[PDB]
């Protein structure tokens, strides 16, 4: 038989993938991996120079590592391999920039501001004036002070990643504006997607403020909205020469920086207390709109799986990995959704089975379609683990198999029906069928939301009901446990990828993250994590110009 | 009265699960390990010292008069105020006779006053120390629930439940608490479940053969028997899922007409 | 009794109603009218059926700029309306003699539901009203139009909006006068959530009634905060009586005396009235003249200064016919009074600090919004304990339509819902009547 | 009236009290005892006078390991507790017959105050009790011992820890059964913020009384959250009646039938009783011979499973006499019940998942802790709407001292203060009496 | 700001009580020194259990330290000075006595 995950198993395992036996305890320990050896030399040098004898890294104490073969990791749809330590979010600059670009993004609309300028302030708003304002905000957003040399300013090379962009559904305003700082919908999207997004947005103008990454490094996520609002107000009162001491300026300030602000994430309450633009506040549909695979691909499985990879690397690796727990983290809890083509093979089988039986989107979402599609995909995914011992050895944790199989089942249900809640219902059925198949499920966590979910997937109660696009890490069932949130966003994307939709939840987020000026390009999230694993990703937020070289 | 049916399914694996769930089913005896050996393998205490105490005995301390609490008899370790200790097993996915959810369910349906917890790589039981030693030696070690090759008692660094067996048919163990001697064919324990080495190796016995392991396992496998050969368990699972969904939506009799 | 203070009650036209009324007759702990307004605010829910229909038709669930393709439901909530209201009333009904009241507003496009007090008697917080109304509305919509089981989440998102993810009602079509109790500035700040524009629209742009509404809510909130407990209760009762309810006709008298005047003339009339009534006396005369003044009654002097503050705001904003002057009038009223008498201002400088807050909040690019959205549950405006907000109601009532944050733009639904109740449309008259009903028990 | 199913009533000893009691007689919207419990839980404040004296004597203001050298006050509050209580009662009194009670506990070491109901009628929430008690205590301490004006800040810091900076009461010596509204994880979760240790210490470690207290609080909360309205109300009413009040003596009979049994024996007892009562019937017989069951009454089967869940928890944790078994018992009762019958769990698997997360956060490095610190407001135990917390309360009642964070360690002031009231200490014998009082009104 | 943000103080006295009376494990200064050696490896992100685990680069965590200080002079005597914050060495005598009290 031919399987998509077979090639990675041939490369990662010396033995035959179907062979049931191997040997251990003859790999030399941690010396089998070049990353561990590099860590050891770096630790000795760092201790002796900086730490003045205080021990930092001691591989001798603790578990004797390397008793089994430390396998390398492929990255799905990419022809490159890396060690598992390179996929850790602290060791991978691409994952850090993935979160940095999302954190530093604020979308503000300029239509109430223009209306207040035209009517209440008596100032004409022309495309030339909009170009002047865009020049002013592009100078002023990173650290700049317009025509005030006495003012203290941030070093420009320290904020090279900062940009202020504009986009609009109004076409004649778009061609009348400067292309230097314009996100052109027509040339960045296909014709049907551009028409759909222009219809959804309307005839309104929006500005995208990319606050510099270092601001998010030093401060928190709620800093970004205040930074963008302050600089937008300053650039508006500078480019348009307005008095900054009257009540009309207060009304214009509301219209310009408090009327149509679109934030990436909401604030979180209680014991998970956090500000806006933190990854616990990002809904699954918003993250689906962040990833831009519908722009460059027509395959619904690939469109869902790029969102799966981005959601894994954000929610499981960064948010739950450090923000909620900390430590070594949950890196290969999440990489198993995007290392090999295991999830790719399972999702392509789900798509093939749905296309053979129910067509592309030929059935209304009922119970029976959910049951039979999720059961078939779960049985196939589990027997694939059964007849490939190398596949079982790769996904050694039962959580890093439950999620994969349930994500494939939910993706298949979302193909068949187009409803995201039906897809999450298929996910929950797949989880309990996995539990009865292997007499096993994840970690010891791991199915608070998977035995509960069944009842809360189609609930209508206040704290139990939400569409899956409106759900996120602050959803009460999904608040704590790893291995679900990233795959939920792919299921939410799979509902709209089956319909061929241009966006999932927010058209403005979809257009904003199509910007070529972003350092992390969200068109191929798997490929750039590979680039950050091979140390060829140029990240932002480095204070190299304010630090000594010795 | 009501006669229990424990699990659905007509396949051999479902029959083994029903046998494990049934408290009136006599588990097949395969080994004979003395109590001192099991105590020294758990590593909580040496055989010879008294049981240490986490709280005074129930007779010495005084309580309020609670009618509902005092008509349940306690364990012998509870009235002696013994500390709560653990025994933790890792079960291989290649036809181990006991499986984590199966074990948990069997231990909660058979033993009194135990805390059972399941994971992918480990299953742990917490109970009072004397009772824990008693049921561990009587049930968990020398029955069909244990195989020295495919099941190892590991208190920490559990890894190997989903890995391939070695050339001796034994599970992977990073700490190597379990060794196989070829000149006798038995299996020896050189460390306790935590990983501290013992004074002398303790023999647990010969590994169960693979042909016997196929007919006593409680896991579904494509190379063994699969869930596709047991549609009744899948139907029960789908019924449970549909009942959960309908109860979550609207918990009325009219909603459950579409069951 | 414990307070020997007597007040004379006047109506909004300056005519005498009754004399020698005890000070505790207008207390929130005694007045039945204030209790009724608190209970009605706690149990009244406003439902936008037209907003629900528009959200479900276009699939506009979520928040600002959010739209889910494929999750669109074509129901007719405005056309049915009465059936939905009957179903919601039947679900929310506890007893047959219940206070459950689901009335139809603007011909079916809005609902004004009042949940029974039985559900609030066993609730630790007021949020039972909105959650119960949301659940009843979801059930009524699912049963009235046969919504599929897989679209109940869409119905919930249209009604409430992002609640399990965002602990608030952001993109929904259900509203209340009180925000989430976890979104308060401080503990006990729930009653200081009604903005100025809501109070103005509820009172149909009446000056004295909006002042009375704002003062009643603010001082009842100070009672809720524990601030008006012990030695501060007399000062808060006097502040409520003289600032919001026009005790001894002080506000009307100062406005009549300063029809052509300025803020300084209002300060002069306030000092003259306080000297004539014996509230303040001469402390000592310095070498350069300037006889210092000390209060013979500290709380009464604070109440007189608060009434004069309201009158000064009314005089200046009736001269300008613009509501942008509130911050400067409060700030420099307190400043001129302090450096004219050597006496403390309203709330011992807290009113001046809140006026500085109003200044930087409504007069700069660092500012945001106008004075119509001022409420005590904001970090800018929380500092004065019910002495700086009721003048803003007079200022917005005197506004001749030169504010972007007009009451018509921000509080039309609130006015249409809460103007039907008599104690909300005319709080002054009914609070005076409730004080008259309990005169003899003191 | 709208529910025609009747229940019997049994006490904690298993003796019959009355028969044919309507289901709505124990409803939170009808039962006078539940209403009185909610009203009294909102006005009762626990005061640590010895804690205040120790904090002031050593300057221990601030919180965890915080000392301010120089702000040390030497007072004798425990000796002058009678005068302090008299002054607090004088300050907090509204009229002269108001239900204001400041009782002295443990010879002046603790103080149990009850602020009047009229102070809470005009309050939107429950925070008025603690703030009013703090202000009354501050004034009483300032005027009893002649504390300088520059040390009233230290007195405030001793009474309430860091309230203007931290919106909570952490370093102070004042407490209540309910948590702060800022700690709520959802709207309507105010009654869910009672930890298990507080409920166990309130009921003096009586198993059935703690089950009744936790069940009454949790189901009244589900009424407050709007969850138990409409078609959802009958399920929560039956869950409160059977799991929490042992309506048909199901809990006591199951525990008696499994005195020397396991969780599985309780499961078969529950299935046998449900079959004998006609609650469940055989749906179909499969080819393997498995008898798939269907509920003839869905909500009654839910209530029977919940009562059996409490019975299984009591049996296993009375056998072990250790409270660390709740999560496993709640998990595997449902886990083997579902695959024995083909029927859904206690809360359609919302409670088994609660146990799967309880098993995470009671046996891992990632958070949680002992079973006693969890509550309905906790992110781990909020998912089951009143069906998983009374088992935890029963298990903590059955604990013999194997927990480090015991109710003695955690709830010493709260338990001693709230055990002085008969309604909080023994909720069974008074909720049954309240049901008997309104038995004839349906 | 980074040094203030990354600082967390945890009292290791309830943990020792849990070790002593719940688990029956004695706590000696030798065991405390072993714990300090372990946590100085684990806090930057080293692996102590769970074979086949990744670790962070030690070059990115050179500023990560786990330190211990005690108000007990007898415990601070036979404690490893590598991980110890010495109050008597870092403070003046009166300030040291006030801090220890
Ligand atoms: C000590 C715990 C208790 C706990 O709270 N977390 C542990 C350990 C912890 C540590 C590992 C510390 C180290 O490197 O030594 C961390 C990294 C959490 C942290 N931030 O410190 C972690 N686990 Ni765990 N943990 C994992 C996993 C797992 C799987 C291992 C499967 C199996 O082979 O048995 C099992 C759960 C199970 O019960 O099945 C597991 C258990 C356990 N995990 C058990 C017992 C470990 C034991 O072997 O003795 N982890 C995995 O399934 C893979 C992902 C992996 C996480 C790190 C990563 O993503 O690289 C890691 C995540
Ligand atoms: C339970 C709760 O911990 P506390 O009981 O509040 O200490 C909560 N845990 C979490 O959500 C941990 C999330 C990530 C750790 C486990 C990932 S599977 C938290 O951190 O606030
Ligand atoms: O073993 S646990 O499920 O507790 C944590 C695994 S990361």
PDB file of N, CA, C and O and ligand atoms in Angstrom, chain A residues 329-330 333 399 442-446 482, chain B residues 118-120 122 158, chain D residues 359-361 363-366, chain E residues 50 53, ligand 3, unseen atoms left out:
ATOM      1  N   UNK A 329       7.521  22.558  28.030  1.00  0.00           N
ATOM      2  CA  UNK A 329       6.354  22.881  27.245  1.00  0.00           C
ATOM      3  C   UNK A 329       5.744  21.685  26.546  1.00  0.00           C
ATOM      4  O   UNK A 329       5.948  20.526  26.912  1.00  0.00           O
ATOM      5  N   UNK A 330       4.977  21.992  25.507  1.00  0.00           N
ATOM      6  CA  UNK A 330       4.180  21.022  24.765  1.00  0.00           C
ATOM      7  C   UNK A 330       4.499  21.102  23.284  1.00  0.00           C
ATOM      8  O   UNK A 330       3.614  21.206  22.435  1.00  0.00           O
ATOM      9  N   UNK A 333       3.782  17.756  21.535  1.00  0.00           N
ATOM     10  CA  UNK A 333       2.328  17.634  21.575  1.00  0.00           C
ATOM     11  C   UNK A 333       1.696  18.267  20.342  1.00  0.00           C
ATOM     12  O   UNK A 333       0.653  17.808  19.869  1.00  0.00           O
ATOM     13  N   UNK A 399      -2.056  11.187  23.364  1.00  0.00           N
ATOM     14  CA  UNK A 399      -2.890  12.416  23.302  1.00  0.00           C
ATOM     15  C   UNK A 399      -3.216  12.737  21.841  1.00  0.00           C
ATOM     16  O   UNK A 399      -3.874  13.771  21.618  1.00  0.00           O
ATOM     17  N   UNK A 442      -5.451  10.096  25.358  1.00  0.00           N
ATOM     18  CA  UNK A 442      -4.289  10.884  25.797  1.00  0.00           C
ATOM     19  C   UNK A 442      -3.582  10.853  27.136  1.00  0.00           C
ATOM     20  O   UNK A 442      -3.269   9.748  27.618  1.00  0.00           O
ATOM     21  N   UNK A 443      -3.348  12.029  27.717  1.00  0.00           N
ATOM     22  CA  UNK A 443      -2.694  12.110  29.048  1.00  0.00           C
ATOM     23  C   UNK A 443      -3.834  12.046  30.076  1.00  0.00           C
ATOM     24  O   UNK A 443      -4.998  11.880  29.675  1.00  0.00           O
ATOM     25  N   UNK A 444      -3.501  12.151  31.364  1.00  0.00           N
ATOM     26  CA  UNK A 444      -4.394  11.692  32.463  1.00  0.00           C
ATOM     27  C   UNK A 444      -5.635  11.938  33.330  1.00  0.00           C
ATOM     28  O   UNK A 444      -5.722  13.042  33.905  1.00  0.00           O
ATOM     29  N   UNK A 445      -5.770  14.495  31.767  1.00  0.00           N
ATOM     30  CA  UNK A 445      -6.376  15.751  31.333  1.00  0.00           C
ATOM     31  C   UNK A 445      -7.779  15.633  30.819  1.00  0.00           C
ATOM     32  N   UNK A 446      -7.178  13.664  29.654  1.00  0.00           N
ATOM     33  CA  UNK A 446      -6.987  14.585  28.507  1.00  0.00           C
ATOM     34  C   UNK A 446      -8.339  14.771  27.820  1.00  0.00           C
ATOM     35  O   UNK A 446      -8.428  15.496  26.810  1.00  0.00           O
ATOM     36  N   UNK A 482      -4.213  20.558  26.393  1.00  0.00           N
ATOM     37  CA  UNK A 482      -3.421  20.641  25.176  1.00  0.00           C
ATOM     38  C   UNK A 482      -3.945  19.648  24.143  1.00  0.00           C
ATOM     39  O   UNK A 482      -4.625  18.670  24.464  1.00  0.00           O
TER      40      UNK A 482
ATOM     41  N   UNK B 118      -5.950   6.579  34.704  1.00  0.00           N
ATOM     42  CA  UNK B 118      -5.480   6.028  33.443  1.00  0.00           C
ATOM     43  C   UNK B 118      -4.776   7.096  32.617  1.00  0.00           C
ATOM     44  O   UNK B 118      -5.106   8.286  32.682  1.00  0.00           O
ATOM     45  N   UNK B 119      -3.781   6.654  31.859  1.00  0.00           N
ATOM     46  CA  UNK B 119      -3.106   7.472  30.869  1.00  0.00           C
ATOM     47  C   UNK B 119      -2.817   6.593  29.664  1.00  0.00           C
ATOM     48  O   UNK B 119      -3.167   5.409  29.637  1.00  0.00           O
ATOM     49  N   UNK B 120      -2.177   7.176  28.651  1.00  0.00           N
ATOM     50  CA  UNK B 120      -1.727   6.371  27.520  1.00  0.00           C
ATOM     51  C   UNK B 120      -0.588   5.449  27.924  1.00  0.00           C
ATOM     52  O   UNK B 120      -0.602   4.255  27.604  1.00  0.00           O
ATOM     53  N   UNK B 122       0.703   4.915  31.183  1.00  0.00           N
ATOM     54  CA  UNK B 122       0.765   4.415  32.546  1.00  0.00           C
ATOM     55  C   UNK B 122      -0.631   4.367  33.149  1.00  0.00           C
ATOM     56  O   UNK B 122      -1.522   5.121  32.750  1.00  0.00           O
ATOM     57  N   UNK B 158       8.034   6.607  32.481  1.00  0.00           N
ATOM     58  CA  UNK B 158       7.248   5.628  31.743  1.00  0.00           C
ATOM     59  C   UNK B 158       7.349   5.937  30.255  1.00  0.00           C
ATOM     60  O   UNK B 158       6.991   7.033  29.802  1.00  0.00           O
TER      61      UNK B 158
ATOM     62  N   UNK D 359      -9.143  14.731  37.685  1.00  0.00           N
ATOM     63  CA  UNK D 359      -8.069  13.754  37.760  1.00  0.00           C
ATOM     64  C   UNK D 359      -6.769  14.320  37.209  1.00  0.00           C
ATOM     65  O   UNK D 359      -5.689  13.961  37.693  1.00  0.00           O
ATOM     66  N   UNK D 360      -6.841  15.183  36.184  1.00  0.00           N
ATOM     67  CA  UNK D 360      -5.653  15.963  35.829  1.00  0.00           C
ATOM     68  C   UNK D 360      -5.160  16.796  37.005  1.00  0.00           C
ATOM     69  O   UNK D 360      -4.074  16.564  37.541  1.00  0.00           O
ATOM     70  N   UNK D 361      -5.966  17.757  37.432  1.00  0.00           N
ATOM     71  CA  UNK D 361      -5.496  18.829  38.298  1.00  0.00           C
ATOM     72  C   UNK D 361      -5.513  18.464  39.774  1.00  0.00           C
ATOM     73  O   UNK D 361      -5.272  19.335  40.612  1.00  0.00           O
ATOM     74  N   UNK D 363      -3.749  15.437  40.429  1.00  0.00           N
ATOM     75  CA  UNK D 363      -2.642  14.489  40.433  1.00  0.00           C
ATOM     76  C   UNK D 363      -1.499  14.912  39.512  1.00  0.00           C
ATOM     77  O   UNK D 363      -0.767  14.056  39.007  1.00  0.00           O
ATOM     78  N   UNK D 364      -1.320  16.211  39.270  1.00  0.00           N
ATOM     79  CA  UNK D 364      -0.313  16.657  38.315  1.00  0.00           C
ATOM     80  C   UNK D 364       0.366  17.926  38.815  1.00  0.00           C
ATOM     81  O   UNK D 364       0.022  18.477  39.865  1.00  0.00           O
ATOM     82  N   UNK D 365       1.348  18.387  38.033  1.00  0.00           N
ATOM     83  CA  UNK D 365       2.124  19.580  38.361  1.00  0.00           C
ATOM     84  C   UNK D 365       1.483  20.870  37.872  1.00  0.00           C
ATOM     85  O   UNK D 365       1.991  21.958  38.185  1.00  0.00           O
ATOM     86  N   UNK D 366       0.388  20.794  37.120  1.00  0.00           N
ATOM     87  CA  UNK D 366      -0.045  21.907  36.291  1.00  0.00           C
ATOM     88  C   UNK D 366      -1.014  22.862  36.975  1.00  0.00           C
ATOM     89  O   UNK D 366      -1.354  23.891  36.385  1.00  0.00           O
TER      90      UNK D 366
ATOM     91  N   UNK E  50      10.806  11.686  31.587  1.00  0.00           N
ATOM     92  CA  UNK E  50      10.172  11.693  30.264  1.00  0.00           C
ATOM     93  C   UNK E  50      11.145  11.647  29.081  1.00  0.00           C
ATOM     94  O   UNK E  50      11.300  12.609  28.331  1.00  0.00           O
ATOM     95  N   UNK E  53      12.580  13.818  25.173  1.00  0.00           N
ATOM     96  CA  UNK E  53      12.118  15.175  25.424  1.00  0.00           C
ATOM     97  C   UNK E  53      13.143  16.160  24.890  1.00  0.00           C
ATOM     98  O   UNK E  53      14.349  15.904  24.946  1.00  0.00           O
TER      99      UNK E  53
HETATM  100  O1  LIG F   3       0.674  12.690  33.036  1.00  0.00           O
HETATM  101  S1  LIG F   3      -0.177  13.914  32.828  1.00  0.00           S
HETATM  102  O2  LIG F   3      -1.402  13.591  32.016  1.00  0.00           O
HETATM  103  O3  LIG F   3      -0.552  14.246  34.250  1.00  0.00           O
HETATM  104  C1  LIG F   3       0.766  15.260  32.057  1.00  0.00           C
HETATM  105  C2  LIG F   3       1.367  14.807  30.728  1.00  0.00           C
HETATM  106  S2  LIG F   3       2.213  16.206  29.941  1.00  0.00           S
END
